[PDB]
Amino acid sequence: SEFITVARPYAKAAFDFAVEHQSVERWQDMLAFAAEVTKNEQMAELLSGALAPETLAESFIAVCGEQLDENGQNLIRVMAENGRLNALPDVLEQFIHLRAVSEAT
């Protein structure tokens, strides 16, 4: 269960529409806080506990303080459905570069 490659598209696919609805601005926080909790010793074990994505899917969006719009809840479940919801930072680093590319042309 280590599809690190899934974070590359996640950071972009989640950014593609985040730009059309002008979410990118407030959306940056959601990914920043999400990527920060996934790389947290206690949260890391909680996420990689079993094959069931539900235990880590709702647990993640909840520990964030329910501050995630519809896409924040849809992404964490799909990310967990692929057995790699803990790869939030794997997408964050990719997303930060997408902003630089959008903030350049």
């Binding site: 599809f3 490659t5 899934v6 590359r8 598209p9 996640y10 972009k12 696919a13 989640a14 593609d16 529409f17 519809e70 896409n71 809840q73 849809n74 992404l75 479940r77 799909v78 692929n82």
Partner: peptide, 22 residues
């Protein structure tokens, strides 16, 4: 290339913004 996790981007774009809307 479209076949490995890197191509799921379009599938993600449809689910990340429209997961519970099918």
């Amino acid at each position: 290339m479209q076949l490995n996790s890197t191509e799921i981007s379009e599938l993600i774009k449809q689910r990340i913004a429209q997961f519970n809307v099918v």
